[PDB]
Amino acid sequence: MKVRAQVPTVKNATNFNMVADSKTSVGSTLENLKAAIAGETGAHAKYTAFAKAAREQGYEQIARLFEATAAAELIHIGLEYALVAEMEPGYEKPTVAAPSAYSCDLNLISGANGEIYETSDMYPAFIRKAQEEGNSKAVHVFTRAKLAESVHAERYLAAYNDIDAPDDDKFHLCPICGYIHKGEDFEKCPICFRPKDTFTAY
Amino acid sequence: MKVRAQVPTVKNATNFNMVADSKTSVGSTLENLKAAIAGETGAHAKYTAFAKAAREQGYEQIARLFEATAAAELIHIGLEYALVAEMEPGYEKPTVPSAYSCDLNLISGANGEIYETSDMYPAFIRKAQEEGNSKAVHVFTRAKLAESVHAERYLAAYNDIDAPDDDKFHLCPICGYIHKGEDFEKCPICFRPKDTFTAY
Ligand SMILES: [Fe+2]
Ligand SMILES: [Fe+2]
Ligand SMILES: [Fe+3]
Ligand SMILES: [Fe+3]
Ligand SMILES: [Fe+3]
Ligand SMILES: [Fe+3]
């Protein structure tokens, strides 16, 4: 993902449309924030399981990608949770059980599909609802998450394509959004503009 | 996709597992070849329609990617048709889509590619192996490998939908491999030299 003159927003970007045949139940923005947190909690458990399996299967680099992405989802949860907490102090983040991890290639596909669903269906749906309800804070949070998900999708497909050709590149995760970059060739986050030296390496 | 020391095959690669919850009806290799052709014919019509829409939507480069991928599916059809014609002389290829916003079309493309690379082709490859049809295994393998590359190209285009560049997309002459830009030497799927590619 290239760095543009300004950070991507639903106002200056053109990949924010929701698939017409959406598989996402949309409620109030508060409900959607909670729904997103639930989905991300599941994603985190999935990627964590996928990472462990990857290591056992001998895919050290892919395991690191799964771990970096799991961490990215935790950032999304943090962003979403912060908004929910302001509106409902008693709200507690949910916990889920760990799902099964299968062959690494299939796990990468599972990851890619989930990411695609989130970036082109769920988040766009939640963003639209937030826009229609005038909840700019939610639009911001959902937009940030949405943008990282499509990057995750690409990273998973790239790993899948080179499943038998890994390298020693580290994955760098942005400190405040889910953007992940493979290798050192980047300057700042294309999603939020945080400098490269603020990233965490996986 | 990186160029390995060896040409990727179902024998030396580890991304040929098929999804457990398959959406692919599997029959004889002959039927599967025809099914693949029908699917690719749909894909070609889809991408051609997406390219047209992309140009109307003002995304010239993405239009070119759609055109390149459509051409890739045509290559797949050619490989599969050749085998079918041999297994059934006289066979006639079938004829067949709605287009939406460019970003959605890229996602639709990506999803179709993922289905083909992780579901359809792997299933057909295994059935071909079971029946001992080596030609089909080779053809299905070649197609399968290109589809995952297409998926990545579509997601890459989606991520930089508002940040196009002047890169041309290069299509391999005998397989569906597509490379964006000039930084490549040969096809990682079949090893064909860069000078034999066609630019889009
Ligand atoms: Fe994600
Ligand atoms: Fe394809
Ligand atoms: Fe997510
Ligand atoms: Fe960031
Ligand atoms: Fe295809
Ligand atoms: Fe090739």
Curated annotation (Swiss-Prot), chain A:
It comes from the Bacteria. Keywords: Cytoplasm, Electron transport, Iron, Metal-binding, Transport. Residues 169-202 form the Rubredoxin-like domain. GO terms for molecular function: iron ion binding; oxidoreductase activity. It is found in: Cytoplasm. PANTHER family: RUBRERYTHRIN. GO terms for cellular component: cytoplasm. Residues 23-168 form the Ferritin-like diiron domain. Pfam families: Rubrerythrin, RUBY_RBDX. Homodimer. May possess two rubredoxin-like centers and two hemerythrin-like binuclear-iron centers per dimer. Fe cation 1 binds at E40, E73, E118, E149. Exhibits NADH peroxidase activity (in vitro). PROSITE patterns: FERRITIN_LIKE (PS50905), RUBREDOXIN_LIKE (PS50903). This is Nigerythrin. Fe cation 2 binds at E73, E115, E149, H152.
